[PDB]
Amino acid sequence: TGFNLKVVLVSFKQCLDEKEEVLLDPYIASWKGLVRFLNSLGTIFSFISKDVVSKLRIMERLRGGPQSEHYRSLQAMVAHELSNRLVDLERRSHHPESGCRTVLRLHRALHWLQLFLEGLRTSPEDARTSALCADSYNASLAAYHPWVVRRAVTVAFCTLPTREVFLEAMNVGPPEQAVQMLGEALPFIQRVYNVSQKLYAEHSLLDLP
Ligand SMILES: CCCCCCCCCCCCC/C=C/[C@@H](O)[C@H](COP(=O)(O)O)NC(C)=O
């Protein structure tokens, strides 16, 4: 029953080393956990997250390929792809699937997840899970999606259960306990997101095609 979300959220701890580099292996591992979380929410969430599975595979290929060492961290990846002109900076052509542009999309998606869970964490007892999901989507990831894609994604929101059931489905006790867990574990995702955001901002990569 439900999903062991705490393990996945806490795994984001492993994504940052002492130098605050975002390590790609744990990043991919944590994201695979998030995909299993999404799968547990139902077929529509599996459907809309196919994009994320595809991008994780792209990153696994790069990390297993000849230049694997250069994808050890997002920092190493950026240095390697920029200096070797392996990133399409203006229009997608010769490197439509660079690690840089690919991780960018994973990162934007991560923001939705963290905003959704944080809204959930602080929600009143009467809040609807569907509204928390839509609101966090439209605040965040929707900005990068064409209106028609937003409509397709939105189909998913009404399939979510009540707040109580959704919280209990995290397998850590009643809603107030699940709330405690999110308070503990969310900071791990937020730190990874912030470090990643600043890295991309620093190199003017936030709008890669
Ligand atoms: C339960 C509430 C929170 C859910 C978190 C959802 C995370 C999964 C990601 C949702 C993906 C949306 C559909 C993909 C759209 C793509 O066109 C887009 C752009 O990638 P592309 O330029 O087409 O390769 N990718 C993203 C992640 O925005």
What technique determined this structure? Answer: X-ray
CATH number of the structural domain spanning residue 88: 1.10.3520.10
Tokens (6 digits) for 81: 């792809």
Beta strands in the chain (DSSP E): none
51 labeled binding residue: yes
Of 46, 51, 160, which is best to mutate to test ligand 1, by the most ligand atoms within 8 angstroms of its C-beta? 51
Kindly state the helix (H) or strand (E) to which residue 177 belongs, with its residue range: helix 175-202
Q: d(Cα 101, Cα 44) in Å, to the nearest integer?
A: 25
145 labeled binding residue: yes
Which residue's C-alpha comes closest to atom 18 of ligand 1?
Answer: 105
Q: d(Cα 153, Cα 35) in Å, to the nearest integer?
A: 16
Q: Structural domain tally of the chain?
A: 1
DSSP codes, 9-46: HHHGGGGB-TT--BBHHHHHHHHHHHHHHHHHT-HHHH
Q: How far is CA 165 from CA 3, 18, 174, 194, in A?
A: 12, 38, 9, 30
- Within 8 A by CB and 6+ apart from 157, the residues are 130, 131, 133, 134, 137
State the CB neighbour count (10 A cutoff) for residue 94: 9
Q: For residues 24 and 77, is the Cβ–Cβ distance under 8 A? A: yes
85 labeled binding residue: no
Q: d(Cα 42, Cα 118) in Å, to the nearest integer?
A: 21
| Ligand 1 center from residue 192 Cα (angstroms) | 18
Tokens (6 digits) for 59: 């990153």
Our measurement of the distance from residue 197's CA atom to the centroid of its chain's CA atoms, rounded to an integer in Å, reads 12
